[PDB]
Amino acid sequence: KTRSSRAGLQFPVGRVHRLLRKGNYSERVGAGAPVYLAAVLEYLTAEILELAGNAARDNKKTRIIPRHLQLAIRNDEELNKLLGRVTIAQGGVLPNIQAVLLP
Amino acid sequence: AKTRSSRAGLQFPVGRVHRLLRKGNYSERVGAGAPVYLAAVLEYLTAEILELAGNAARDNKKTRIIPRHLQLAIRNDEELNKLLGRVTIAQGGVLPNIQAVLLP
Amino acid sequence: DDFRDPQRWKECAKQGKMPCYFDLIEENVYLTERKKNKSHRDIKRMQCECTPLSKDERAQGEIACGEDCLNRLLMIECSSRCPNGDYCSNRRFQRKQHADVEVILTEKKGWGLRAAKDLPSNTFVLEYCGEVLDHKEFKARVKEYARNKNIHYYFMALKNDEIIDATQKGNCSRFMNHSCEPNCETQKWTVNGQLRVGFFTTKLVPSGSELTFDYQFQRYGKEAQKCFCGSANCRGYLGGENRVS
Amino acid sequence: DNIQGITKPAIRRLARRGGVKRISGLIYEETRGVLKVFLENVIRDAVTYTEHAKRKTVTAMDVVYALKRQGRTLYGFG
Amino acid sequence: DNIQGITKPAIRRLARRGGVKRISGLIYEETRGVLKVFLENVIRDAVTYTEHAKRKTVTAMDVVYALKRQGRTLYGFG
Amino acid sequence: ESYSVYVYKVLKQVHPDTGISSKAMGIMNSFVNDIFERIAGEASRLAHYNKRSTITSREIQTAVRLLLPGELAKHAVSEGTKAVTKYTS
Amino acid sequence: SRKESYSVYVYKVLKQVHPDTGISSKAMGIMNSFVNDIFERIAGEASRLAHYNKRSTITSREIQTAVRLLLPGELAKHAVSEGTKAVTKYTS
Amino acid sequence: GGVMKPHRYRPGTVALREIRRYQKSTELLIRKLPFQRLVREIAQDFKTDLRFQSSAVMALQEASEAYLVGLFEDTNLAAIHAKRVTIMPKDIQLARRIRGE
Amino acid sequence: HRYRPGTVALREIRRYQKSTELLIRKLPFQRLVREIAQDFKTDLRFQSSAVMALQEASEAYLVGLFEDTNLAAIHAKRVTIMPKDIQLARRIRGE
Amino acid sequence: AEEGDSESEIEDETFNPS
DNA sequence: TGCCTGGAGACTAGGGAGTAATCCCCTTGGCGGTTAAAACGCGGGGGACAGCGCGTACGTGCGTTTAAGCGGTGCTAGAGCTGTCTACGACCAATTGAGCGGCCTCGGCACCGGGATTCTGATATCGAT
DNA sequence: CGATATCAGAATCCCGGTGCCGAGGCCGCTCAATTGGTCGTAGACAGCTCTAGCACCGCTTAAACGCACGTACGCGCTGTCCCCCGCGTTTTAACCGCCAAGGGGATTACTCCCTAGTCTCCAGGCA
C-alpha cells in the first residue's frame, strides 16, 4: 500500500514529498509535512470541483468546462479572495450589470 | 589574503552574500560569480539611493541623511519609484503634492 | 361581427364588413426558410436571473418576470428554457396572447382598429404577422403588384434581408392606421432567436377608442399617396419628394 | 471599544497629509471601518507568526512579515 | 505599426464584456496605448526568460512566468 | 508530470457522473501547482524566519492559516490534521 | 549574540558618494531593510530562474537575468554593467 | 405607397444586449491574426528574429483581454461615479492611477 | 480677522506634508491594536517597535488611500471627499 | 424537445486519461 | 505484450529539535503633573446638489469592402534530449583579520528667541453712468 | 454707483545662542571568511531526431469600414440651502517623567529521535 492510502487521500503524497525535498523549500523535510500538504491540496481541489460541478448542473450540463470553474471561483467570496489575482483561460466574467445602466 | 570583495573591487561583502545565497536555500549550488555579481548590484543600488539622498540632504541643508531624504530620493526618481512603489518608509512622510483644482 | 369561418362570404374585395373574401392568416409565414439562424447558438442561454416562485401563484403570487425581468427590458422574450417554465409572463408572442380589438370604418382613408375595453399603457396588442420576403422577391412583388391595382401596400422593412409583406395574408393588425398622435407603437421583439414586430400601447386607451400608431413610412413607388387623419399636426404626404430605395 | 480613539482631528490630519482640501462628516466612521479592517488583516497574520514561534510577545518582525506578506513591505524595522 | 489592428469594434467588445454601456470616441487610442504598455511589459519579460533559456521560440511558459512576475497569474497554459 | 489523474479521481467523489474537459483539467493542474508553490514557499519562509531547518506539519499548518481565508482555512486545517492523524497510525 | 548588519558597507558606499555627509540610525535601518529586501528579491528570482531552466546552480548569469527582470528602465542597464564590471575584475 | 419601418431600437438597448452577449460567452474577442501581428511587432524591439509558440500568443491574448476587461470594469465604475454613463479617457487614467499603475 | 474657507486647509496640507511625524495619537492607536489583537490570541504582549511598525504601516496605508480618494472626489468634479470616494478607491484598489 | 448546437461542445473535448 | 521507474521497507549516522534552568531585557502596569489636543458651539462661505436647456457625438442601422480563419501543402529552424567528460563548486581543516559589540567623545541638530518678509483679506482713486 | 487697487496683522522664515544625545570613531576579540587542497557531478558541449512553427495560397464570409441621422447624453450655468470650515472657549487625557515587578525571550548543556542517504523489493502503468 502507498502513503496515500495511509493518509486516506487520493493525492500523491510520494510526489508532494519528493517535490518538497527537491524544490529547495528547506534543507530537510518532515514526514508529516507532505501528508498535511497533500490533504490540503486535495481538499481545495474537492471544494473547487464541488462548486464547478454545481455550476455545471445549474446550467443543466454534465461536463465541467473552464467557464464552470470561473463561475464557481467568482461566486464564492473566499475562493474569490484567494484567486482574485488569477486569470482563468476561457473563464470570462459574471454579468454584474450595474443598476444605473438598466432603464 | 585579499578578500573576495577586494579582488572584485567592491565595498559590499561578497563573502556574506555567498553565505546567504548558500544558506537561504535559493538553490542546491551557488556559483563563484553569483555572489560577486549580486554584491555589485546591491552596491550599485545603494550608491544610487545614497547619491539622491545626499543631494536631498543638501537641498534641506542637513549634514545627515534621515528617513525623509530616503523618501524624497525614492519618490522623486521615476526608476527607484517604480522599483519601490509598494514600499512604506518609516518616519518618511510623503512628497508635497497639492492637486491643481484644490488651490485658488 | 368578425365571424371567422372557412366559407368565404359576399364582399367587393375590400375585407371591410366580412374579413373572409380573401384569405387570412394567424401567424407569420416564411418563403425562403433559412438554416442559418441565431436561435441554436446565441439566445440559447440569455435568460433573466429572476428567482422562480415555487409555491406562490394564483393567490398572493406575483407574476414571474415582471418589469424586473432583464429580457423584458431588452425587448427579448424568454426562451423555452426560462427558469419560470410556463409561469413566465414574458412569453406573450409565443402564447398567442392578444388584446380585445374590433375592426371598424372611421374615415374615407380606410378601415381601422378600436379597443373593445379599458387598456393600460405598455400593454401588448398584436403581432404584425405576414409573409417574410427575401432580397429577390420583394423587388419583384413591388413592381408586379402596382399594375395589379392594389389600393394598400403592407411592406415593412424588418432587416437588411427580411421584409414582411401582409398583402396576401395578414392577421388583425394589418388594419392599424397611421396617427401623428398615436396611442400605440411598433416595437422590435426577438422571440426564440426570431425577430418579430409587436404593437404596444403608449397611453391609456378608453373602452371603444380607435387604436393607431406612428407609421414610420417611406414612399418607394413612382406614385404619391396622402393621409387624411388630420388630428393636430398631420404631415399628410409620405416622405416628401424623396427617392430612397 | 477603542476605535473611537482614532479621533476626528487625527483622521483629518491623515486626510490633510493625503492632500484632501475638504472632508465630509461621514468620512470619519468610514475611515474607522477601513482602518479596523486593515489592522485586523495585519494583526491576524502577525499573531499567526507569533503563535508559530509559540511566543507570547508580538515582535516588530512579526508585524513586518505580516506586512511583507500582504505586499505592504515596510522599511525601518528589519 | 500593427497596433491599429486592435479595431474599434474589438475594443468596444472588450468594453462590453466589461459591462460598458456607452463609449467616448477618444477611448480607442487610450486603450491602444494601455494595451501596448501592458504587452510591452509582458513581452519584455517573456523575452528575458527566453534569452535566459538561450531559446528563440517564446514558450507559453515564458509568457506564464512573465505574467506571474507581473503579479497576474494565468491558469490554463502551465 | 501532472496532478491530472488525481484531480479526475477526486472529481468522482463530489460528482460521480460529471466529466471535465481537457482545458478545465489544465486549469485544475495549474491551480494545484500554484497553491502548492504558495504553501511550500510560505512554509519555506516560516522555517527560515524561525531559523529552523525543516518544513514540519506545523509549518504547513501555519502557511495554510496564513494563505487561506477564515472558513476555508479551518476546513483545510481539519483535513490536514485528520490526514496526519491517520497516516501516523 | 552577533547580529548581521549592512551598516559598515552602507557607510563605506556613503563615504564614497558623499564623503562629507552622514546617516542617522533610522536611515541606516531603512538602508538595511532595502538591501535585505532587494537581496531576497534578486535571489528569489534567480532561484525561480534556476528552477525553470532545471538547473541546480545559481550562476552569475542567473543573477544577471534576475536583475534584468526585477529592475526597471535604465537602472537595469547600470546594474548589469556594475555586475559585469565586478565579475570581470574577480575573474582576473 | 411604400415600405415602413418598426421604430429604431431605443439607444442603449443594443448596448445592454451586447453586454449580455459578450459577458455570457467565453471566447477571445480581439481578432487573433491582428493581435498575433501586434505581439510579434512589439517583440521585435527586444530581440531580433524571434519566433513564438502558438500557445504563447493564446496565453498573451487571454492575459491582455483579462487585463482590459478588469480595466474597463473599474473604468465603468469611474464613469458611474461623477454621475454619468459614458466611458472617457479621464476614467481609464483614473482607474489606472487609483489601481497604482 | 478670519481666514477664508479652505485657506487654513491648504495651510494644514502644507504643514502635514512637510513634516514626518505620526498623526495618530500613540496611546489610542496602541490600545486599538491591543483590543483588535485580543481576538486572535488572548493577552498578547507587544514589543514597543511592533506597535510603532503597525502605526507606520496603518498611516502610510490611510495616507495613500486618501491620496487616491482625493483623485476620486476630484474626478467627480467635487472638492469634498465622501464615503462614496473611499468605497470607489477601495473597489478599484481591490478590497 | 429543443437543444443547442453541438459545435459548442466540439471545441472542448473531455479529459482522456490515456 | 514487458519491464522499468518510481515509490515504499529497513536500516543507518549524526545533527536538528526539544527540555529543563537560568539570566535579565524590556514590557506592563502604576501614579501624578503638565499642557497640548480633542471636544464642543457657533456663524455664515463656499460647495454639493438639483434642475434645466443645449449642441453634438454617440448608438443603431444600413450597404459595401476587406482580410480574418479554414484548411491545406511544404520547408526546416531549432526544441528537445540524449551521451562525454571536465571545469566547477561542495566540503573540510587549518588559519587570521573583518566587523559586531560595548565603549566614550563632541558637533549636528532641535529648539527658543526676536525680528523681516509673506501672504492673505480687507479698504480706496480714477472711472462711469 | 463701477474696476482695479492700498494697508493690517497672523503666519511664516531667518540668524543666532544653547545643550543635549547619538553619530562616529575607537578598541578587542570572537567567529566566520579565506586559503589550499581534494573530490564527485552539473552542465557545457557535440551531435542527432522531428515537431512544431513559419511561409504562401485561395476561398469564403462574417467583420470591419464608411456614412446616414436622430435624439440622449454630457455639459455649462443658475440657484439654494446646508454643512463644512475657521475660530474661541472648555474639557480631559495623551504624554512625560521615574519607577518596579516579573514575565518570557534568548541562552546554555545534554538528550534523543527524527530525517537523509543508502540499498533492495516490487507494482502501477507507457505505447
Residue numbers in the entry:
A (entry chain g): 15 to 117
B (entry chain c): 14 to 117
C (entry chain O): 1589 to 1833
D (entry chain f), E (entry chain b): 24 to 101
F (entry chain h): 35 to 123
G (entry chain d): 32 to 123
H (entry chain a): 33 to 133
I (entry chain e): 39 to 133
Article excerpt on this structure:
To investigate this, we prepared another complex for cryo-EM analysis on a 15 bp longer ligated nucleosome template, representing transcription to bp 174 into a Widom 601 sequence. Sample preparation, data collection and processing were performed similarly as for the State 2 complex, leading to a reconstruction with a resolution of 2.6 Å for Pol II and 3.6 Å reconstruction of SETD2 bound to the nucleosome. In the resulting State 3 structure, SETD2 is bound to the distal H3 tail at SHL + 1. The additional 15 bp of DNA induced approximately 20 bp of DNA to rewrap the nucleosome, making the proximal H3 tail inaccessible for SETD2 binding. Further transcription enables rewrapping of DNA around the proximal histones and repositioning of SETD2 to the distal H3 tail, facilitating methylation of the distal H3 tail and completing H3K36me3 deposition on the transcribed nucleosome (State 3).
The deposition of H3K36me3 occurs co-transcriptionally when the methyltransferase SETD2 associates with RNA polymerase II.
